[PDB]
């Protein structure tokens with residue numbers, strides 16, 4: 001059990017092993033950049049906010065720890081360490097997560113075509129991985145991407161520039177059991193914005209968002225209406241003045257023709273029709289980066305716990321177990 005030291009950093013207390021030095025806020029759970037003396041690398045350390053205050057909090061704490069413990073891929077955030085200042089379960093009331101620091105987010109950054117190719121490539125690559133484990137990200141947007149000065153990119157999730165602008169229309173719509181494909185919609189939104197420097201859909205609310213969305217992709221067609229269960233959704237949509245799908249080549253003029261082609265395949269209204277991460281990787285746009293033998297899938301991820309209703313002390317204790325059983329990577 002390492003030796004700990006405590007500190008105040010903007011109202012919050014931090015009690016971290018001595019191996020981590022030069023703590024310095026980055027954003028607020030609270031996150032701090034630090035120097036990891038054991039490995040020579042700058043890190044990010046996230047102190048979970050009130051991890052066991054309710055059943056919701058406690059389950060969310062367990063959810064993120066379990067998940068981050070499973071993520072082992074270059075384009076997805078991983079765990080360098082997890083620790084608590086607690087010497088037993090009774091004492092356990094604080095969780096800290098450690099990861100490789102990256103320079104900035106993609107919100108902080110119009111780019112060259114070679115840059116978007118590499119950036120979107122890596123997003124699709126981590127997403128292929130995440131999707132193979134049956135995880136949907138749900139909240140992909142430029143600030144959920146960490147990018148370094150080498151342009152190396154990791155997918156993460158702060159849970160805090162409006163989420164809704166990147167959000168798939170079906171979610172704007174409280175659709176039941178939507179799928180992985182919601183993330184590909186997000187990636188197309190992101191890719192567009194890197195190509196143009198402009199938010200593709202800067203909607204002022206959920207209704208505006210869809211109005212802006214339909215204006216580009218057009219109103220749902222016969223085949224898509226067949227699949228709408230909701231009668232009020234259906235009447236409303238068919239009562240709308242119909243738009244045809246714009247020509248993306250006219251919308252994204254001067255963009256690599258292959259970039260435009262890919263956007264057409266991502267930014268489809270019917271989510272069964274969207275290209276997948278696996279498929280997209282093989283698209284001609286990523287010719288200079290694609291390598292089928294280095295685009296790995298995840299070990300299976302069991303999230304059956306999601307359907308369990310447990311007591312705060314049961315989530316806490318499960319989390320405790322996951323802290324204790326943690327094996328640092330090489």
Ligand SMILES: CC(C)(C)c1cc(NC(=O)Nc2cccc3ccccc23)n(-c2cccc(N)c2)n1
Nearest residue numbers: 044045046063064077097098099155156157158159
């Ligand atoms: C889907 C995916 C990309 C693997 C993911 C990642 C996260 N959590 C994080 O990215 N957490 C972190 C964000 C920012 C800085 C961190 C620093 C150290 C450890 C985690 C961090 N996720 C997450 C899961 C559950 C709840 C929350 N809030 C976030 N989810």
Ligand SMILES: CCCCCCCCO[C@@H]1O[C@H](CO)[C@@H](O)[C@H](O)[C@H]1O
Nearest residue numbers: 169170177178179227269270271272
């Ligand atoms: C103007 C609003 C149009 C929204 C239509 C979005 C279509 C979403 O696409 C739908 O996704 C569902 C959830 O994954 C699937 O079950 C359906 O098969 C698929 O058609």
